[PDB]
Design an enzyme around this catalytic site. Structure first.
Site, short mmCIF file in Angstrom:
data_model
loop_
_atom_site.label_atom_id
_atom_site.label_comp_id
_atom_site.label_asym_id
_atom_site.label_seq_id
_atom_site.Cartn_x
_atom_site.Cartn_y
_atom_site.Cartn_z
NE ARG B 111 76.21 12.58 -17.03
CZ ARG B 111 76.86 13.60 -15.73
NH1 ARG B 111 77.04 13.18 -15.10
NH2 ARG B 111 77.44 14.40 -16.60
CD1 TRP B 280 66.96 10.01 -27.61
CD2 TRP B 280 67.09 8.50 -26.70
NE1 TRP B 280 66.46 10.36 -26.11
CE2 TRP B 280 66.45 9.47 -25.48
CE3 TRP B 280 66.22 6.98 -26.12
CZ2 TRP B 280 65.40 9.57 -24.46
CZ3 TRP B 280 65.82 6.59 -25.31
CH2 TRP B 280 65.34 7.50 -24.42
CD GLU B 285 74.66 13.63 -30.10
OE1 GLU B 285 75.17 12.83 -29.84
OE2 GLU B 285 73.62 13.96 -29.26
C1 HEM Z 1 69.31 8.20 -24.31
C2 HEM Z 1 69.53 9.61 -24.72
C3 HEM Z 1 71.14 9.63 -24.72
C4 HEM Z 1 71.23 11.67 -25.22
C5 HEM Z 1 69.97 12.50 -25.19
C6 HEM Z 1 72.76 11.53 -24.98
C7 HEM Z 1 73.66 11.98 -24.88
C8 HEM Z 1 74.44 12.57 -25.67
C9 HEM Z 1 75.40 13.29 -25.65
C10 HEM Z 1 74.85 14.33 -26.18
C11 HEM Z 1 76.68 13.66 -25.91
C12 HEM Z 1 77.19 14.30 -26.24
C13 HEM Z 1 78.25 13.86 -27.38
C14 HEM Z 1 79.17 14.40 -28.23
O1 HEM Z 1 79.98 15.83 -27.79
O2 HEM Z 1 80.68 14.02 -29.04
C15 HEM Z 1 76.47 12.37 -25.04
C16 HEM Z 1 77.82 11.73 -24.00
C17 HEM Z 1 78.35 11.00 -23.87
N1 HEM Z 1 77.60 9.94 -23.46
FE1 HEM Z 1 75.23 9.92 -23.81
N2 HEM Z 1 73.18 9.98 -24.34
C18 HEM Z 1 72.15 9.04 -24.64
C19 HEM Z 1 72.16 8.07 -23.85
C20 HEM Z 1 73.98 7.08 -23.08
C21 HEM Z 1 74.04 6.21 -23.03
C22 HEM Z 1 72.46 5.20 -23.10
C23 HEM Z 1 74.98 5.99 -22.80
C24 HEM Z 1 75.66 4.07 -21.75
C25 HEM Z 1 75.24 3.70 -21.15
C26 HEM Z 1 75.53 6.96 -22.62
C27 HEM Z 1 77.25 7.42 -22.05
C28 HEM Z 1 77.32 8.39 -23.49
C29 HEM Z 1 78.85 8.96 -22.65
C30 HEM Z 1 80.33 7.28 -22.03
C31 HEM Z 1 79.63 10.33 -23.47
C32 HEM Z 1 81.24 10.19 -23.17
C33 HEM Z 1 81.44 9.81 -25.38
C34 HEM Z 1 82.76 10.43 -25.49
O3 HEM Z 1 83.25 10.92 -24.50
O4 HEM Z 1 83.00 10.56 -26.50
N3 HEM Z 1 74.71 8.04 -22.69
N4 HEM Z 1 76.25 11.54 -24.60
C1 LIG Z 2 88.25 11.18 -28.22
C2 LIG Z 2 86.95 11.58 -29.94
C3 LIG Z 2 85.63 12.06 -28.97
C4 LIG Z 2 84.24 12.58 -29.69
C5 LIG Z 2 83.01 12.21 -29.19
C6 LIG Z 2 82.04 11.67 -29.73
N1 LIG Z 2 81.15 11.36 -29.06
C7 LIG Z 2 80.32 10.84 -29.67
C8 LIG Z 2 79.09 9.73 -28.44
C9 LIG Z 2 79.48 8.72 -27.73
C10 LIG Z 2 77.90 8.07 -27.15
C11 LIG Z 2 76.56 8.60 -28.02
C12 LIG Z 2 75.42 7.84 -27.03
C13 LIG Z 2 75.43 7.56 -26.36
C14 LIG Z 2 74.14 9.14 -26.50
C15 LIG Z 2 74.43 10.21 -27.85
N2 LIG Z 2 73.01 11.39 -28.02
N3 LIG Z 2 75.37 10.85 -28.72
C16 LIG Z 2 76.91 9.88 -28.73
C17 LIG Z 2 77.47 10.82 -29.22
C18 LIG Z 2 85.09 12.52 -30.91
C19 LIG Z 2 86.23 12.34 -31.85
C20 LIG Z 2 87.12 11.96 -30.79
C21 LIG Z 2 88.36 11.97 -31.32
N4 LIG Z 2 89.51 11.43 -31.02
#
Ligand code: HEM
Ligand SMILES: Cc1cc(CCNCc2ccc3c(C)cc(N)nc3c2)ccc1C#N
Ligand code: HEM
Ligand SMILES: Cc1cc(CCNCc2ccc3c(C)cc(N)nc3c2)ccc1C#N
Ligand SMILES: C[C@H](O)[C@H](O)[C@H]1CNc2nc(N)[nH]c(=O)c2N1
Ligand SMILES: C[C@H](O)[C@H](O)[C@H]1CNc2nc(N)[nH]c(=O)c2N1
Ligand SMILES: [Cl-]
Ligand SMILES: [Cl-]
Ligand SMILES: [Gd]
Ligand SMILES: [Gd]
Ligand SMILES: [Zn+2]
Lengths: 404, 404
Positions: B111, B280, B285
């Site tokens: 973030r 990215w 992951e």
């Molecule tokens: C640019 C580099 C970014 C990195 C390194 C990053 C990193 C991450 C990671 C590692 C997660 C956890 C994913 C998982 O555990 O499955 C996550 C979740 C999330 N990210 Fe980021 N992100 C990035 C960009 C963004 C952007 C551009 C957005 C939205 C505009 C965003 C919004 C979110 C949201 C909403 C979640 C929750 C997804 C979920 O609950 O499944 N991120 N992010």
């Molecule tokens: C509810 C749920 C949630 C998830 C988490 C998946 N989130 C994936 C994700 C979503 C957004 C990302 C973004 C925006 C960046 C990044 N590096 N990784 C990202 C990874 C997996 C399974 C379930 C289910 N069912």
């Protein structure tokens, strides 16, 4: 009734036990604080209500609820408190409660063992010299030449008016932490202040970074007094690695018995400010937290140099490499020394086995996900993928203010 | 009466005053914490009260709070709800709103970047066909030949009288998962369902482990239409290890762009059930989760065997060593391929700086500890030792049920 899911297998259970939770936690519908270290920050008719509850679950556990001495036992406690103000626990009760408190500790991953626990009743302790010997049987029974055995030693229940029994170290075995001109610390920084408190109570300081602190034992009212530990009781394991011949030269050691001497045991509404319990270590405890934490021994960079790793970019994952080897050397060294130690995979998997047992028995199990998941390889262990409910059951172990 | 939050590595204390604005409600009570649940969740006057709040945020951020243009916009909005039961966002308001949603996402370690987000306005979109075009464009801009950019495409808001725009795919790029004769799965098991759907909607399945899935795109009141991604649009990174040359013979691959496509975006009561966004990857992951999870690609043992590790006993830490090598390969293959990627150490460091930026700005920062801490090397990273308050702010991304 919380729907709890396991995401590795897809199974679903319900935590009906949470329903009978009492001592309210820190979280609210508007914000979760489950990641806090201290949840709950730190006329006697409240004593009775807590007391009848414990007694009821006591007889529940032996089937003999309803009629018999169950009926009877409620009166004795009633009369005891009515007359005196406090009450005394039958010895079998104190053993039941101590085990329950273990079984109810959400942050402990060793609970598959909760049934096998040796309780030593020191409620007839009366002196600091007396506490000391009690402590010294425990350590001896617990250590048992490296065949470690879970033990708790219970000292008198805090009573209305007049002071507590209390141990001033957080553990029974603690390495010294010395400040200096740098303001940096030789030894273990976690124990810098208790080292401060030792010396100012007449302890001749020491050499360096693995000096077993002396105890500080506080008999009621009378101020604390030091008690040097016999070098043969304090079993230790020098640290060597199976293939990295230079590791031993680093001169790393760690003790055998994890034994906590500052937490407060509560059973049936009674508070035991002195109740040291010991089990055996999980390896990440020593290898990852104690030696690798930036604010503990912080040895990670030194190990990485010796492994000739690229410490210039974080993307070589040199931290992760060093840390695995420091863990391999811990499991190895404890094994060579034939001292009981459990790896995190072995431990977490046993915890899963505990969750299923605790499902059938009590309809749930209070767990603190952040403390159950290991400090390394979290997602490589089954408990990472397992939803958990955290709550407070009695009897339990609580934290308490330190006596300063 | 605001949460005291402590950084255990350094000793810092700060209070989260932002938590008291928490516009929605989470799964925790003081009886029991439920912060480890993956799913912590599941009228004109309320649409107004959400909207007025957003408008307030918007005019705060442009340092024009309580002004003409501000009270104008309130009156305009609360009068547009009167005539149509909805209202429309101005474009600047849409851009601010998409960033905030990212800023407020408690489960995002990346973030720090929240301000640099490219917002594509596709609210004029008209069919599943124009929808596809806008998506292809998003993938093209975001991928950018391996030098990745953050973007979001916002399709038309859920409205009275019409069905939703919905992308059925959890992510724009996803590998197929095929059931088998063994009862087992070929390719990615997380996408067995969507794969079933695609096939039944006319897709002609492959039989590989990394077959990229077509898109299923739903325009209002229409069955989902199926669209193939143009091969040259999907940048992939073949996985190799920098010192284990047998690794490339695993035939493992991953794609450059993590584009989540099934989450709802909420802005001032308005809901965008289709607004795919992408950043990215953080190496874990791919390395830890997507490949090593038992329920995903599960290559852990197969790697460890090849490493000639002793997989008979867990105390050999074979799981941990094999995992660290899988991660090293991911960071390395991506760096080789000139495709943006961040390691969990670098990722967690910038998150700490984010927390520090956020405390000065809003007096706090929503964070899901168990999500922020990497699935390996937790205590090695700084976020392990930081207490965090989890809460829900608006604008936000939310989960939403599958349209099928
Ligand atoms: C640019 C580099 C970014 C990195 C390194 C990053 C990193 C991450 C990671 C590692 C997660 C956890 C994913 C998982 O555990 O499955 C996550 C979740 C999330 N990210 Fe980021 N992100 C990035 C960009 C963004 C952007 C551009 C957005 C939205 C505009 C965003 C919004 C979110 C949201 C909403 C979640 C929750 C997804 C979920 O609950 O499944 N991120 N992010
Ligand atoms: C509810 C749920 C949630 C998830 C988490 C998946 N989130 C994936 C994700 C979503 C957004 C990302 C973004 C925006 C960046 C990044 N590096 N990784 C990202 C990874 C997996 C399974 C379930 C289910 N069912
Ligand atoms: C016998 C093997 C045991 C193992 C493997 C084990 C495992 C653990 C571990 C790894 C922790 C984490 C503590 C930390 O990281 O700081 C812990 C905490 C704890 N354990 Fe166990 N334990 C064992 C025995 C016991 C016994 C005998 C008791 C009580 C009688 C007990 C009660 C507790 C309590 C109350 C905590 C919380 C500590 C705190 O909050 O500070 N454990 N245990
Ligand atoms: C509240 C607090 C707690 C802790 C953790 C202390 N718990 C350590 C412990 C306590 C008991 C153990 C037991 C019984 C077994 C085992 N293997 N490890 C154990 C480890 C550290 C600092 C603080 C602080 N402040
Ligand atoms: C803030 C965070 O809760 C804190 O650092 C916790 C995380 N999990 C832990 N888990 C164990 N076993 N021991 C600890 O000291 C901690 N520290
Ligand atoms: C049940 C458990 O909370 C669940 O597996 C969580 C743990 N922490 C996580 N953290 C991240 N970043 N991503 C995840 O998918 C998960 N899974
Ligand atoms: Cl320890
Ligand atoms: Cl993914
Ligand atoms: Gd050398
Ligand atoms: Gd090689
Ligand atoms: Zn909570």
């Amino acid at each position: 009734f919380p729907r709890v899911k396991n995401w590795e297998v897809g199974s679903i259970t319900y935590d009906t036990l949470s329903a009978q939770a009492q001592q309210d936690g820190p979280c609210t519908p508007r914000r979760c604080l489950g990641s806090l270290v201290f949840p709950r920050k730190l006329a006697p008719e409240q004593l009775l209500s807590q007391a009848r509850d414990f007694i009821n679950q006591y007889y529940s556990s032996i089937k003999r609820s309803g009629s018999q001495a169950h009926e009877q036992r409620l009166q004795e406690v009633e009369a005891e408190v009515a007359a005196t103000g406090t009450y005394q626990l039958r010895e079998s009760e104190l053993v039941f409660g101590a085990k329950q408190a273990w079984r109810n500790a959400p942050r402990c991953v060793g609970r598959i063992q909760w049934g096998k626990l040796q309780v030593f009743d020191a409620r007839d302790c009366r002196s600091a010299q007396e506490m000391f010997t009690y402590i010294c049987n425990h350590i001896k029974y617990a250590t048992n030449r490296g065949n470690l055995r879970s033990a708790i030693t219970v000292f008198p229940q805090r009573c209305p008016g007049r002071g507590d029994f209390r141990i001033w170290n957080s553990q029974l075995v603690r390495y010294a932490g010395y400040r200096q001109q740098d303001g940096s610390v030789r030894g273990d920084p976690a124990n810098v202040e208790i080292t401060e408190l030792c010396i100012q109570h007449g302890w001749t300081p020491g050499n360096g970074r693995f000096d077993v602190l002396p105890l500080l034992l506080q008999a009621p009212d009378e101020p604390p007094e030091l008690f040097l530990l016999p070098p043969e009781l304090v079993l230790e394991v020098p640290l060597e690695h199976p293939t990295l011949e230079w590791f031993a030269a680093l001169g790393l050691r760690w003790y055998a018995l994890p034994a906590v001497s500052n937490m407060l045991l509560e059973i049936g509404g009674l508070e035991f400010p002195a109740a040291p319990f010991s089990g055996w270590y999980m390896s990440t405890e020593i290898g990852t937290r104690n030696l690798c934490d930036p604010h503990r021994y912080n040895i990670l960079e030194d190990v990485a140099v010796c492994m000739d790793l690229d410490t210039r970019t974080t993307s070589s994952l040199w931290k992760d490499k060093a840390a695995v080897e420091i863990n391999v050397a811990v499991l190895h060294s404890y094994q060579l020394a034939k001292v009981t130690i459990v790896d995190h995979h072995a431990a977490t998997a046993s915890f899963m086995k505990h969750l299923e047992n605790e499902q059938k028995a009590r309809g749930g199990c209070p767990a603190d996900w952040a403390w159950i998941v290991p400090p390394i390889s979290g997602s490589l262990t089954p408990v990472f993928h397992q939803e958990m409910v955290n709550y407070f059951l009695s009897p339990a172990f609580r934290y308490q203010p330190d006596p300063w």
